Amino acid sequence: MLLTRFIKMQLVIFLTLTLVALVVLALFYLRLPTWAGLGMYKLNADLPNSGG
Amino acid sequence: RFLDSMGHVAWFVVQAIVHVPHAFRHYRRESLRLVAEIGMGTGAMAVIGGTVAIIGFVTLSAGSLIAIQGFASLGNIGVEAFTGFFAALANIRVVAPVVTGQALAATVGAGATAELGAMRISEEVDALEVMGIKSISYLVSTRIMAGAIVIIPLYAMAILLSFMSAQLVTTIFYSQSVGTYEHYFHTFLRVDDVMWSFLEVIIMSVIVMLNHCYFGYFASGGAVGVGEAVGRSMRTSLIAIVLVVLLASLALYGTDPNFNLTV
Amino acid sequence: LEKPLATVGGFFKMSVMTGKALFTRPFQWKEFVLQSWFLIRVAFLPTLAVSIPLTVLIIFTLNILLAEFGAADVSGAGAALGAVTQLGPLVTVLVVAGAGSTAICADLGARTVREEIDALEVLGIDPIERLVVPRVVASTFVAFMLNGAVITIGLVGGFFFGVYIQNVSAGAYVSTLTLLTGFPEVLISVVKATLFGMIAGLVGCYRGLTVAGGSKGVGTAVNETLVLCVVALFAVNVVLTTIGVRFGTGR
Amino acid sequence: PYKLAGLILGLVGVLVLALTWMQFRGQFEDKVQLT
Amino acid sequence: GVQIDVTGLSKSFGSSKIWEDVTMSIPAGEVSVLLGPSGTGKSVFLKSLIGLLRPERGSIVIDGTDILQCSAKELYEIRTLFGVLFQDGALFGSMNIYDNTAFPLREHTKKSESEIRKIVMEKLDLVGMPNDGHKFPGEISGGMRKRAGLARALVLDPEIILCDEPDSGLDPVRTAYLSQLLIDINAQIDATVLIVTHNINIARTVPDNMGMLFRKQLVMFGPREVLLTSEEPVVKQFLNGRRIGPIGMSEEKDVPPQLQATPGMPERKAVARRKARVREILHTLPPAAQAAILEELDR
Amino acid sequence: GVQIDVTGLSKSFGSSKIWEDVTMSIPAGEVSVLLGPSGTGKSVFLKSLIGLLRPERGSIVIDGTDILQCSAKELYEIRTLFGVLFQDGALFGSMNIYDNTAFPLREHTKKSESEIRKIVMEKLDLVGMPNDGHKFPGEISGGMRKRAGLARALVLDPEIILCDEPDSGLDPVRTAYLSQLLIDINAQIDATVLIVTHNINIARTVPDNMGMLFRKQLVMFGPREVLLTSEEPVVKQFLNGRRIGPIGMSEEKDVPPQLQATPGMPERKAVARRKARVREILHTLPPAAQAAILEELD
Amino acid sequence: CGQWRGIANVPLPGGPGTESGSMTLYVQMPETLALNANSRVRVRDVFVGRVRKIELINWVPTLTVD
């Protein structure tokens, strides 16, 4: 049923647009690897006072 | 009357929600067709890009407005390097969700209301009931599933284009340095705000699709009544989107504003 | 591109004829009054219901961000600024394109499919002068008044919300309203409102007079009317905002 | 059963409003007062 | 009642053509009927004769003035002599029946209010709505809508009347009532009534002249006698509602005693001139048709 | 086909009432036609016989199961032996003629693609559209819409078929073609056809049984032999299209030989049963009607 | 209308000094340093009052404090 090959073109172009938009927003605009901590190691420090 | 009207819409939304698994397991092809239709528009609006193009244009306009007014005011005061950060806190919080919601309401909601009203007038709802097919499950639940599937890419594109427009307007038209803008933006933007905004937008889109499908499913008065259905559905969508964003922002940042500059 | 360009040319020709009828033929007081009241009654309650939560949200965001910044005494200033330069015109755009433009398009489509336009035409009456001109004038008048009401209600609601919830100072609010707002801002707001009303009325009337009949013609006409109004009003708002901030109060 | 679902929807709306008001006022979290 | 001369008229929507070369001559005061298979665009033709549409070619000479060339300023007077009834009546929903009828009188003439009231009441009573003038178009039936549209078209004393499908959405009894009313008005006013319909009960009893459109062409036009006794396959098939012949399954693949005016109504003048023109055509007619028409005229 | 037995039906939209009291007995396998003036609510009656509307009282007993009060699963099982021909076809514009035709037997039957294609093509050739299966509902005329609606209503081999104003938007010639197709359909699959209309060609050549609605009531129902020779003023007036009679100008004031099936078709079994029923009824008619019917039977 | 001094100088409701039992004082300042009405009256740096009117009588500014 259906599969008119015109709806399929719309579906694939929409999926490509979705993937590109999500990757660009997550990498270059939100920096998800930095927010999560990808490629980053943890360090600690002790302060006499916070200093704000 | 008023209580009965509320009960009618409550019954409609309950019936549409409970039939989502049935549509998911039995109407996959209809869901894919509706997803393609919503993502690429229909009619004479599908040649200009459909819902994607309208969302993009309106979000670009909103981001341009934010960047222009913010840079103007901050330059007049003098502290104009904050614009970047300001722009972020204008997009995620109050502008981009509401504007994307209104544009999505207009395009997709009016299209769905028109389609359902046309089917009601053309007696295709009766044709569906004659073949022993759940009309509400076939139409409204499939529309809701398609809208829930399609809202996330649409809002991601809207956020991306609003950020891009604000950055381009600030750092090209007003010739601010890209480094300062990017630093303040990436320093004073929290991904938690973006994720909660995405949840707000998903809830808002589900409510909008429910309201528009309700107005389109119970249309009456021939081809003339479809237009009045679209108008009433649009008014209700405006009110619902604004209320949803207000309540969500009040709940999320009521006690912790999730923003720190001073000590 | 040929078909959209031809439709744009038809819209321009219809608007030109509308202006010629407005400045040449006698005005229709009765139809203007009726359409003004109709547009008021279809877009008054949604106007408040969209403006009040939106201005409350913006005031809440501004107050929390300023309190974290530490300079919460200037909360009124921005509170006025946006509410005169963006919130008013944009709420007017939304509630006019959604309610009044769609209502006008639906009404003229109803008259077209019922052959009332041809009924007017066979009696020698030009449809434009009798119908479109009062509708556009009423749309402009209603948009102007609704923009004024939006700005006033938004300012008062922001004051009450901030003072009675976030414990900001009332004096620091009412005495900083005029800090970044003056005659340029209210003037550009009025210009925006009038232009938005005129454009919305023109697009609604043009789409209503060219409805496709059938069973989905009026619904498609209303949907396209709304989309065109939204896009055009947002573009015009961007242009007018740039022009207005060129003559800014702070500079 | 229209009026039954209308009452359910109204109760859901009122409860959502009350819950978001309490979250805005921070009634859920407990804090101690010092003078 | 005035003559219409349609010559070489053609129309086309897009690349598709509705019809072409519709060469006819609608007489003065004679109820003509245009009929054909549904989907041949016959309301298009009726609308073209007044100027609501623009035919691609041809001419429509009414009272010596070409409609397709005269500017919009002259048309303001040209359409003073018309009266048009639309399918649904095309009334105005914002005003009642009384105002719907009085609208042309309040628009064109400068008559006093009493004169307007007298004319509107007289014309409303003439169509069978004597005390039903205070109602609205949204709360009246289709037949009453057609009656009120006629009463709106009968106040300016027209010289041409165009009726668009006076049978749509009506059962045969009410269609017969409306046809009797149309014969009454053509007897009283002599107002060149032209009717478009695919109905047959209208096409056997009401008209004086008739013509058929088929396959985007006019197969023939003429008086009642020449057509009701014509051995042409298309006309013989359609005028009886048959099944074998030119007319196909759908568009994709392709005498009865004429109605008399009621007693107390003046004599119709269209019958005499129609019979004279029929005698001329009989001079031109084939022998079998000649004999049939001569038998008919001697009754 | 199966017999429908309407009993004491009544409908009302608010204070206004559509009809008052309708009692029928629609015989199995026979084409029946319900007539009346304009605005008598015949399409409401056609809707109610499948349950799309809810009459206030009365009963509509299909087989032995009163469907006016039954569980929704009972209704959805009943409506497999039904078929409705709406005024415009009520096709779905999103899919072509082939998909619109194959939709009912894809939603109900567990058939393969080959058998589905075979039955759909057979039903398309039956309604005379052998190669118009890939076109869309907007690319075809009204008559082709009615053809496709019929072909879609025939795929489930219904025991009842409903037809709503087949004359609407059709000239007399194409209406004659469609009526011939309806008679052929009743001859081949032997399905109880019901038609609501006011067309007089249909009312005088097509049916086997006829009923008349006027002033919100059923004046009478019966076979064509009985009704065509009726002395009742309303029936005689409407069937002869007269102007003088009870029927007013508007709602405010309120024996043809029949047409046989195409040669090559199986014998339309409803003719013999209609003759037998009218022969049994014959002893309760006025003498002139009795004489006319007796002459017609021979 | 005649005494209209702007939206900053209108006495506003709510806050300290508006409830019943609030006392009214007159403060004869030498110069008000462009002070507006609805400003805060502070005792020990605690917001405990509001200034109502800043009228000028015989060229010496007198403040009405609640």
PDB file of C-alpha atoms in Angstrom, chain E residues 34 110 119 148 165 190 219 234 290 294:
ATOM      1  CA  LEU E  34     -29.856  25.749 -23.526  1.00  0.00           C
ATOM      2  CA  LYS E 110     -34.343  57.962  -6.794  1.00  0.00           C
ATOM      3  CA  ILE E 119     -42.986  48.116  -5.984  1.00  0.00           C
ATOM      4  CA  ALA E 148     -36.876  35.939  -3.825  1.00  0.00           C
ATOM      5  CA  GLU E 165     -30.625  25.983 -13.307  1.00  0.00           C
ATOM      6  CA  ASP E 190     -42.201  39.830 -22.311  1.00  0.00           C
ATOM      7  CA  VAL E 219     -24.979  20.892 -32.290  1.00  0.00           C
ATOM      8  CA  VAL E 234     -27.787  13.631 -30.029  1.00  0.00           C
ATOM      9  CA  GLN E 290     -42.513  19.700 -42.671  1.00  0.00           C
ATOM     10  CA  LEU E 294     -47.860  21.423 -40.449  1.00  0.00           C
TER      11      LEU E 294
END
